[PDB]
Ligand binder design. Structure first.
Ligand code: NA
Ligand code: NA
Lengths: 37, 162
């Protein structure tokens, strides 16, 4: 199995920050770590 | 339609209040990373004395574990950083990790941010402290990617040397 690394540039990832799939509240997070609480 | 973008590795976020690590969430896509990051407190808002750590699956932020014990860390000092600058540096470190930005990204174990009042520390942990080529490539790319300056005192320490 010839390995080939999966690499992303920072800008590419930052451009996904506002995606609808990037807005899912994470399920298993203690309330003390949530923003604004 | 939108499709998630897998990461090369699975990563886990850990939170330390002050053995005592708390495993929070794992993720394996860019969008699941953002879903987590967008909903949790940034470093500039977490309890003083706490840590966040992001490590590859099956590695913990404990140096004495088998996965880390022969390794070391690149340590970045942040003296009296503004909140936005602190948070942006941490985020850029996380993106270097999950995006596999290093040629020797395989030698990466994870990163830790220590929130410590007047100063803060961000460290990037590597697996083999004697792997010269990897240690130097990772350190150089950190300097460049993060636009570190002399006041960050970028330095490499073996875990066994404290
Ligand atoms: Na930022
Ligand atoms: Na390597």
């Amino acid at each position: 199995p010839h390995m080939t690394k999966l690499i992303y540039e920072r800008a590419f990832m930052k451009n996904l920050r506002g995606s609808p799939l990037s807005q899912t509240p994470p399920s298993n997070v203690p309330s003390c770590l949530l923003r604004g609480t | 339609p939108h499709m998630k973008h897998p990461l090369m590795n699975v990563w886990t976020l850990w939170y330390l209040e002050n053995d005592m690590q708390n495993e929070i969430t794992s993720f394996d896509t860019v969008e699941d990373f953002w879903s987590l990051y967008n909903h949790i407190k940034p470093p500039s808002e977490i309890k003083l004395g706490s840590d966040y750590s992001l490590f590859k699956k099956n590695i913990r932020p404990m140096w004495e574990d088998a996965a880390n014990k022969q390794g070391g860390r690149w340590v970045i000092t942040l003296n009296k950083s503004s909140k936005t600058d602190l948070d942006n540096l941490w985020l850029d470190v996380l993106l270097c990790l999950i995006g596999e930005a290093f040629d020797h990204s395989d030698q990466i174990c994870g990163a830790v941010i220590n929130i410590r009042g007047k100063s803060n520390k961000i460290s990037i942990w590597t697996a083999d402290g004697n792997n010269e080529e990897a240690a130097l490539e990772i350190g150089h790319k950190l300097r460049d990617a993060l636009r570190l300056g002399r006041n960050n005192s970028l330095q490499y320490q073996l875990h066994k040397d404290t």
